[PDB]
Write a protein that binds this ligand. Structure first.
Ligand code: CLA
Ligand code: CLA
Ligand code: CLA
Ligand code: CLA
Ligand code: CLA
Ligand code: CLA
Ligand code: CLA
Ligand code: CLA
Ligand SMILES: CC1=C(/C=C/C(C)=C/C=C/C(C)=C/C=C/C=C(C)/C=C/C=C(C)/C=C/C2=C(C)CCCC2(C)C)C(C)(C)CCC1
Ligand SMILES: CC1=C(/C=C/C(C)=C/C=C/C(C)=C/C=C/C=C(C)/C=C/C=C(C)/C=C/C2=C(C)CCCC2(C)C)C(C)(C)CCC1
Ligand SMILES: CC1=C(C/C=C(\C)CCC[C@H](C)CCC[C@H](C)CCCC(C)C)C(=O)c2ccccc2C1=O
Lengths: 146, 742, 141, 90, 30, 80, 144
């Protein structure tokens, strides 16, 4: 009640390190927290659902923004079969010169990663042909997460 | 005093005890209530210390078991000799040893397994053997099969004699307790009689039989034209023509002008150019000297007469700076319990086996042995594994003694108490050493891998970027190379060709031996070896020291030696017994031995073994890629595991196909072991409950109610399957590679 | 029984070891075991090694109750010796721990209060659903 | 031959300093005064923590941003001409 | 531009240190 | 501190009291058995959870039950 | 006391070892923590300067040592952080010192103020200042 596991006094009384280890482990078991009722459990579940939706929308928006900013969508749409899609750029202080020269692929001017997710084809099929569309979609998804 | 004391007919031979199983223990003898009884009947069969408490019966049982083991060993030797005599190509291999592969087994023609009869050579088809028996027989002077048949018959006779002796000494005349407790006479007889006399007789055989026949063979004489061994003894003219010193007879030996025997007793050293092995004269000289040394050393302890030494007096009268009174009550402890002696002998035998493997690979003592690569590899790996297993067993028996035979009231020792009073510091220091060694040794490899993966080959720990050279080993190598010039004037050349410096020795177009270079890779692998050995030592020592009691459990000695746990309390007390410590150290012994054998195999294939053309260039099997590819884990995985496994997986449809099958089968067994190491008993018991219900519905319920295995039994099964699978995988891979490529 | 006191009892002959008291004894608590021996003899300490117990009264300091009880039960089983142990706190309070009624727990004694008794079979406990959303437990009822 | 006293428990439980020393300070008074006057601003704990965090972050960011391509191979970029894919992909 | 050279060190190093310090202080607090 | 409970199926064989390593259980007079006694667990705070009492108990199912609960210094078996 | 979990050995109890350890700045009880922390930080930074400049990624270029020196300073900062939090979670504002009160002989002595909020704060400040000064001195001596 006074230590880190505020939802469980029994786990907060012991002096060993397991109090930390179990504290992370039982944070989502709402039926184990002391002084619990049905109303509180249902409301916490509802709030967790909302948070999960926000996280999903933020993830999709980030993917769209990175593809727009550091990708080659406009070069890929013209020749789909002879262009390798790009996911995001690579910045690494540990890279040597051979790694920098060898990781440059596609039309990029620096090291990049090839996207095996398959979102280029999905976005091309539904009717996106420019970077502005991707930017608008990212903005809309950020608004939805908020 | 020293005397022969026996008891007449202590036991009566009858079959009444054969009918009832488990007669040794009353609990087992009562009868089977569940299936677990069966699993117990084999576990307590050889625990003589638990059947009774009198030392006399235990000693008699031990003596009889030793006799039975000797009989079994003699039977095995006789079988090997008979196979060599009947189904083998020894006579064909004798004439052309370089171009013929030894074989001593023939497979039947029932199913289609006749493809296993490969074309070994010499007009024969069979399985190529790697036991190295042909070289032993050649070095002994055997040139026919009748002698092998006679040896097999003699082995059979000796096995029968050993079995009869065991029966006689258990059921007719059994020695008393005072007979076994006489260690001075036993030591005198084992030193002077068993070792000195045997080596002296073998030296005599080598002088009289092996040397002339081997000289005739090395000259180029056909094996069918060599005179029989007894002709040399009967005809002194032949020996005079061979060695003129024999013309003088035994007069020089008593005349002390021993130089006349310099013809067949030499001190040259090195390898014989014709056969690629040690000189037989040097071997005979060494055996003679060893016989003299053992015969002299066998008269040290006082038995039945005034002259001699007392072991108890030597131990008690010992005074030193760090020791003090020290060894006061060790004699009673060593002469009271069998387990301490068993542990000491097991550790010594394991160390001796490892030393034997090293000395045997370094200096080949048999003719045409260095140029046969499979035999060398098999001998090295086998002896290393045996030594590791013995070293592991020593700690288990030490823990058994400390658990069940230690009492500080009647038999008290100061050194053991002093060691037991500060175990925490020892354990902490060993833990720190293990952590430090592991961190450095593995971090070097991980750093090399990361630097190579980032396109930075100039930042690695290699011979080109950052050099870590074994300076001390190189200094020792140079000293050994320069040894015979000034330090050892008697020897013409150095003991071994391994030392950096000298010439190359090759026999029949194949390299026999050449100096071995040392670099950064050897440094890293040696440190890895040290780390693994230290971790195994830490595990075994922690198991041995904390057997009686611990801070967590203050009364661990009451529970015994083989108990699963104490309970779910105290946070959990699983695997607290010393048996669990041994079961855990088995894994680390396996790991260490696997790493050692991998290092030896790759280094020997890369830097020593190979072929020589007429011009004088040497081409190695893997072309010397050890020094640049073994500094990273990816190199070990690609240039050793991936590259050298081509032969084993492509052996289907050929005479090596069996090996390939094993390369799969062992794998399966390994995975099977996991089932016994990741689960628990309750799930299996609850499943057997439903299975038993399904049986009960159809009136097929057995009286012996099925029960799941105990925890200790499950752990033992898991570790046994793991070890067997891993060892069989390594065996199949090594044999397939070294037979297909060498 | 009235609790006793341990004013100035001596200690057995020990050479010292690393299995002794730690910071918990100075911070939290420790335990003291006292017995009486008729002759001088050697026994085995729970912390490792052997010690010698002087003839007469003997006192010893340990870290946990399990060590005290193990030593006491070994003494009773082997030497036939009566013993008793207390628990000592940093503030100086000494609490009598071993037999509180003056007799060993394995012997039934009148005037003893019963704790933790449930007058039902082990299979008569209610299901966990019946005690849901309350601070009690099924076995407590 | 006694080791348990109820009046005091520091000796009974072993509360000692093995290597503690109570000797006066050997440092020169002038140097001590100089160090005391000059090291004063770092005495406070929260201020020290905030200053350390902010200064470390700002310095690391400034050094990373201002760094040139000679020190960092990543900032230098590729130099060789590009390469084609396995199936002719760009 | 040069945004990665400013943002990668921030997320990689500074933020984990701040989060670790805050979490350790909150956990150890009584 | 763990929870130790005793049920009325006990027959007063005194094995659990002897098996306890921390002196948790004792025996009291009773009325509903031939032995005229029953076990009890007053010193619950000293329980460690070894479950030796359950190991030594003759019944169809144990008349003494141990349920693990909130841990402390004593129940964790710590000497440092 | 034979019943305390510690043993007496020549290494752990010798006049030379005792004198050398008691004269170390970490054991001077009477001195205020700032002067001890300054010396500790100076020594630690001066030692730490070396390996970074001798085995750094840029150790072969002309910038090498300078860069290495910077790295050393950074480490000191991190170490200072690792000190500050250790105080905050350990010592409260009003609690007294928790150091042992009596010496080995048995004499009552004043407890060390290092195990206090103000004492630890002074120690950390002195350590930071001394570490920075030592790093700067090592760099100046090595590359001037
Ligand atoms: C485990 C051992 C290990 C070791 C020894 C090294 C060593 C090295 N690494 Mg590698 N590395 C490792 C594992 C290891 N690595 C692992 C697991 C990884 C992750 C995959 C890496 C990844 C890596 C990277 C990414 C880089 C390196 C690089 C380097 C070098 C940088 C050294 C440095 O700047 O800090 C040294 C700092 C110190 C403070 C030294 C502390 C040790 C002192 C000397 C203690 C000695 C104690 C003394 C005896 C005490 C006695 C007390 C008495 C006086 C009273 C160095 C040669 C860098 C490189 O470029 O080098 C070419 C580099 O960029 N390493
Ligand atoms: C997550 C992101 C991340 C990032 C961006 C870095 C970044 C860097 N690493 Mg680190 N590292 C990380 C995670 C990360 N690391 C992890 C997870 C590990 C464990 C495997 C390491 C282990 C490691 C090693 C073993 C080495 C590095 C080194 C380097 C540097 C390489 C650049 C160079 O070539 O030297 C250019 C020259 C320099 C010495 C830079 C000097 C200036 C620095 C940035 C200090 C600025 C001081 C400032 C007060 C820092 C403290 C503030 C605090 C908030 C952090 C650079 C600072 C190398 C190094 O620092 O050398 C000793 C190196 O040897 N790193
Ligand atoms: C060390 C133990 C040993 C081992 C493992 C073997 C192994 C083998 N023996 Mg050998 N053998 C041994 C000792 C041993 N022998 C001894 C001591 C003798 C002397 C009596 C012989 C005499 C011998 C003969 C005469 C023959 C074999 C043959 C065989 C093979 C088939 C056996 C068979 O199918 O029996 C069937 C099983 C039962 C009757 C039951 C098998 C490889 C056979 C062979 O290889 O034929 C091609 C065969 O003809 N052995
Ligand atoms: C000089 C005579 C002598 C010899 C040759 C031996 C030799 C041996 N003893 Mg020792 N021993 C001796 C004196 C001798 N002992 C005395 C006086 C005592 C009483 C103190 C003992 C007490 C003793 C015990 C308690 C044990 C041995 C064992 C052994 C065997 C070890 C197994 C092995 O290493 O493989 C080497 C293998 C061979 C060389 C086999 C060859 C067969 C030998 C030559 C048999 C003839 C030996 C015998 C002493 C002579 C026969 C006397 C009898 C006919 C009247 C080996 C046969 C151990 C054993 O294995 O038990 C069976 C064992 O448990 N010995
Ligand atoms: C030098 C000889 C030697 C001797 C005489 C002993 C003697 C003894 N040992 Mg020790 N021991 C030794 C070496 C030796 N040990 C070694 C090298 C190790 C390390 C592994 C051990 C480890 C050890 C343990 C872990 C234990 C003992 C125990 C015992 C006692 C019981 C023996 C038993 O019941 O087995 C009877 C035989 C068996 C149960 C057979 C088991 C099946 C084996 C494991 C399979 C091997 C399979 C085969 C190689 C592969 C082919 C497969 C094919 C069959 C399909 C006995 C006094 C036991 C004890 O209780 O001591 C008080 C005990 O728990 N020993
Ligand atoms: C390959 C996997 C594996 C690994 C890595 C380990 C590792 C270890 N074992 Mg375990 N073990 C394993 C499998 C493994 N085990 C299995 C299958 C068993 C059979 C049950 C056991 C049973 C066992 C026993 C019985 C014992 C150990 C012990 C040890 C430790 C040895 C001391 C030492 O070397 O530490 C040094 C560290 C390493 C070798 C681990 C790798 C570290 C590398 C260099 C990375 C470091 C990089 C860097 C710091 C990471 C930072 C990045 C982060 C900031 C993001 C070590 C933690 C021994 C022990 O604990 O005593 C000390 C011991 O007694 N093990
Ligand atoms: C440091 C260790 C060392 C070792 C292990 C050896 C070992 C040996 N010496 Mg050498 N020797 C050494 C240093 C050493 N020597 C030094 C410093 C000198 C100079 C005085 C010699 C001079 C020397 C002579 C003069 C002889 C040997 C001989 C021998 C061999 C027979 C030993 C024996 O007499 O019984 C043996 C290989 C003997 C020999 O070579 O016979 C084969 C012999 O005659 N040694
Ligand atoms: C949703 C998940 C998401 C994920 C996994 C990533 C992942 C990544 N980002 Mg992106 N990013 C996202 C959303 C996401 N981003 C959003 C919503 C924005 C708009 C503010 C950005 C803008 C952005 C920038 C400006 C940069 C990255 C960079 C990076 C890389 C290094 C991490 C970093 O520096 O953090 C930076 C994190 C943020 C600025 C916080 C955004 C959180 C929300 C508002 C990594 C590939 C770096 C890079 O390009 O390296 C090559 C970089 O410089 N990202
Ligand atoms: C291989 C084998 C075998 C065989 C074996 C054999 C064949 C053996 C032999 C052996 C022998 C055959 C031996 C011998 C020995 C001898 C001896 C041991 C001797 C001695 C001597 C002496 C000691 C002397 C002395 C003297 C002197 C010094 C001087 C003068 C006087 C006199 C003479 C007395 C068998 C089948 C079994 C088994 C299997 C394997
Ligand atoms: C390691 C090993 C092995 C091997 C072994 C061997 C090889 C052995 C040998 C052994 C030997 C090789 C032995 C020998 C012995 C001998 C003897 C024991 C002798 C005796 C003698 C005598 C007794 C004599 C007498 C006499 C005479 C006759 C004359 C003069 C006088 C007199 C009296 C002196 C095997 C593989 C199995 C495996 C396991 C391990
Ligand atoms: C698989 C498994 C079992 C189950 C294993 C069992 C029941 C062994 C079964 C062995 C044989 C196959 C049973 C039958 C043996 C008879 C000899 C069969 C006679 C009939 C003919 C075949 C001759 C455990 O009991 C267990 C216990 C603890 C930890 C892990 C495990 C575990 O992993």
């Amino acid at each position: 009640a006074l230590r880190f596991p505020r939802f469980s006094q029994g786990l907060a009384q012991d002096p060993t390190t397991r109090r930390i280890w179990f504290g992370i482990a039982t944070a989502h078991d709402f039926e184990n927290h002391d002084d619990i009722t049905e109303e509180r459990l249902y409301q916490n579940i509802f709030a967790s659902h909302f948070g999960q939706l926000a996280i999903i929308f933020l993830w999709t928006s980030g993917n769209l923004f990175h593809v727009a900013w550091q990708g080659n969508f406009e070069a890929w749409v013209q020749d789909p079969l002879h262009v390798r899609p790009i996911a995001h750029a690579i910045w690494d202080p540990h890279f040597g010169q051979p790694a920098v020269e060898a990781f440059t692929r596609g039309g990029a001017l620096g090291p990049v990663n090839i996207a095996y997710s398959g979102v280029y084809q999905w976005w091309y099929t539904i009717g996106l042909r420019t970077n502005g569309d991707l930017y608008t979609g990212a903005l809309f998804l950020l608004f939805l997460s908020a | 005093e020293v005397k022969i004391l026996v008891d007449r007919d202590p036991i009566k031979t009858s079959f009444e005890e054969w009918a009832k199983p488990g007669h040794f223990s009353r609990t087992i003898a009562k009868g089977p209530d569940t299936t677990t009884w069966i699993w117990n009947l084999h576990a307590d069969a050889h625990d003589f210390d638990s059947h009774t408490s009198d030392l006399e019966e235990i000693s008699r049982k031990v003596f009889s078991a030793h006799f039975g083991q000797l009989s079994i060993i003699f039977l095995w030797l006789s079988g090997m000799y008979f196979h060599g005599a009947r189904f083998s190509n020894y006579e064909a291999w004798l004439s052309d040893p370089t171009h013929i592969g030894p074989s001593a087994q023939v497979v039947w023609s029932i199913v289609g397994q006749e493809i296993l009869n490969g074309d070994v050579g010499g007009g024969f088809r069979g399985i190529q053997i790697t036991s190295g028996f042909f070289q032993i027989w050649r070095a002994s002077g055997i040139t026919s099969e009748l002698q092998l048949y006679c040896t097999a018959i003699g082995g059979l006779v000796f096995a029968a004699l050993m079995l009869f002796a065991g029966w006689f000494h258990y059921h007719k005349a059994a020695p008393k307790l005072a007979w076994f407790q006489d260690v001075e006479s036993m030591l005198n007889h084992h030193l002077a009689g068993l070792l000195g006399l045997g080596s002296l007789s073998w030296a005599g055989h080598q002088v009289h039989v092996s040397l002339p026949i081997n000289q005739f063979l090395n000259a180029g004489v056909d094996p069918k034209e060599i005179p029989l061994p007894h002709e040399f003894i009967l005809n002194r003219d032949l020996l005079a023509q061979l060695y003129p010193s024999f013309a003088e007879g035994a007069t020089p030996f008593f005349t002390l002008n021993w130089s006349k025997y310099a013809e067949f007793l030499t001190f040259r050293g090195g390898l014989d150019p014709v056969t690629g092995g040690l000189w037989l004269t040097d071997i005979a000289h060494h055996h003679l000297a060893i016989a003299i040394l053992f015969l002299i050393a066998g008269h040290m302890y006082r038995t039945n007469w005034g002259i001699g030494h007392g072991i108890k007096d030597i131990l008690e009268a010992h005074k030193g700076p760090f020791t003090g009174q020290g060894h006061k009550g060790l004699y009673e402890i060593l002469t009271t319990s069998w387990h301490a002696q068993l542990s000491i002998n097991l550790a010594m035998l394991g160390s001796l086996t490892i030393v034997v493997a090293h000395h045997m690979y370094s200096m080949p003592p048999y003719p045409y042995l260095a140029t046969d690569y499979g035999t060398q590899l098999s001998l090295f790996t086998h002896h290393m594994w045996i030594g590791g297993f013995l070293i592991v067993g020593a700690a288990a028996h030490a823990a058994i003694f400390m658990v069940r035979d230690y009492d500080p009231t009647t038999r008290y020792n100061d050194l053991l108490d002093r060691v037991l009073r500060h175990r925490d510091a020892i354990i902490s220091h060993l833990n720190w050493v293990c952590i430090f060694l592991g961190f450095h040794s593995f971090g070097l490899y991980i750093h090399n891998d990361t630097m190579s993966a980032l396109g930075r080959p100039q930042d690695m720990f290699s011979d080109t970027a950052i050099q870590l050279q074994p300076v001390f080993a190189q200094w020792i190598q140079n000293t050994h190379a320069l040894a015979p010039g000034t330090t050892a004037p008697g020897a013409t050349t150095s003991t071994s060709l391994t030392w950096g410096g000298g010439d190359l020795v090759a026999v029949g177009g194949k390299v026999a031996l050449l100096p071995i270079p040392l670099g950064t890779a050897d440094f890293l692998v040696h440190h890895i070896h040290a780390f693994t050995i230290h971790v195994t030592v830490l595990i075994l020592l922690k198991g041995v020291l904390f057997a009686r009691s611990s801070r967590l459990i203050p009364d661990k000695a009451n529970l015994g030696f083989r108990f699963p746990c104490d309970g779910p309390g105290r946070g959990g007390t699983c695997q607290v017994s010393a048996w669990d410590h041994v079961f855990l150290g088995l894994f680390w012994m396996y790991n260490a031995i696997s790493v050692v054998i991998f290092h030896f195999s790759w280094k020997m294939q890369s830097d020593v073994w190979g072929s020589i053309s007429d011009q004088g260039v040497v081409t190695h099997i893997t072309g010397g890629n050890f020094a640049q590819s073994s500094i990273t884990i990816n190199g070990w995985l690609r240039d050793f595991l991936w590259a050298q496994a081509s032969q084993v997986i492509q052996s289907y449809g050929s005479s090596l196909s069996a090996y390939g099958l094993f390369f799969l089968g062992a794998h399966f067994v390994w995975a099977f072991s996991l089932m016994f190491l990741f689960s628990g008993r309750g799930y299996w018991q609850e499943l057997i409950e439903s299975i038993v219900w399904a049986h009960n519905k159809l009136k097929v319920a057995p009286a012996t109610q099925p029960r799941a295995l105990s925890i200790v039994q499950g752990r033992a099964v898991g570790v046994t399957h793991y070890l067997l699978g891993g060892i069989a995988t390594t065996w199949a891979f090594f044999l397939a590679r070294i037979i297909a490529v060498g | 029984t009235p609790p006793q006191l341990d004013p100035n009892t001596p200690s057995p002959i020990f050479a010292g070891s690393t299995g002794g008291l730690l910071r918990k004894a100075q911070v939290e608590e420790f335990y003291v075991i006292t017995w009486n021996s008729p002759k001088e003899q050697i026994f085995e300490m729970p912390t490792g090694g052997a010690a010698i117990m002087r003839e007469g009264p003997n006192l010893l300091k340990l870290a946990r109750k399990e060590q005290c009880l193990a030593l006491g039960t070994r003494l009773r089983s082997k030497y036939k010796i009566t013993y008793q142990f207390y628990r000592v706190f940093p503030n100086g309070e000494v609490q009598y721990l071993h037999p509180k009624d003056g007799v060993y727990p394995e012997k039934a004694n009148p005037g003893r209060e019963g704790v933790g008794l449930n007058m039902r079979s082990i299979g008569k406990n209610v299901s966990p659903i019946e005690v849901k959303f309350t601070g009690k437990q099924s076995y407590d009822l | 031959s006694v080791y348990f006293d109820l009046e005091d428990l520091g000796n009974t439980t072993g509360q000692w300093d093995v290597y503690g020393s109570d000797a006066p300070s050997p440092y020169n008074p002038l140097q001590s005064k100089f160090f005391e006057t000059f090291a004063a601003p770092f005495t406070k704990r929260g201020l020290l923590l905030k200053f350390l965090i902010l200064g470390g972050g700002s310095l690391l960011t400034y050094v990373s941003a201002t760094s040139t391509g000679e020190v960092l191979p990543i900032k230098r970029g590729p130099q060789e001409p590009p390469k084609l894919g396995p199936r002719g992909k760009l | 531009n040069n945004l990665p050279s400013i943002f990668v060190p921030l997320v990689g190093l500074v933020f984990p240190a701040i989060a670790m310090a805050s979490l350790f202080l909150h956990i150890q607090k009584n | 501190s763990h929870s130790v409970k005793i049920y009325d199926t006990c027959i007063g064989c005194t094995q659990c009291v002897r098996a306890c390593p921390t002196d948790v259980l004792e025996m009291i007079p009773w009325d509903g058995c031939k032995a005229k006694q029953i076990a009890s667990a007053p010193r619950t705070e000293d329980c460690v959870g070894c479950k030796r009492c359950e190991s030594a108990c003759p019944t169809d199912f144990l008349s003494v039950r141990v349920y693990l609960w909130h841990e402390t210094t004593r129940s964790m078996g710590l000497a440092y | 006391d034979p019943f305390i979990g510690s043993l007496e050995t020549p290494v752990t109890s010798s006049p030379l070892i005792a004198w050398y350890l008691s004269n170390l700045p970490g054991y001077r009880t009477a001195v205020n923590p700032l002067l001890r922390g300054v010396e500790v930080g100076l020594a630690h930074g001066f030692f730490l300067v070396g390996p970074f400049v001798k085995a750094g990624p840029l150790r072969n270029t002309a910038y090498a040592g300078s860069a290495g020196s910077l790295a050393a300073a950074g480490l000191v900062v991190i170490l200072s952080m690792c000190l500050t939090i250790y105080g905050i979670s350990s010592f409260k504002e009003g609690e007294p010192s928790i150091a042992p009160s009596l010496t080995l002989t048995g004499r009552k002595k004043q407890p060390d103020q290092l195990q206090t909020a103000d004492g630890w704060a002074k120690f950390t400040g002195g350590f930071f200042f001394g570490g920075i000064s030592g790093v700067t001195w090592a760099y100046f001596l090595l590359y001037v």
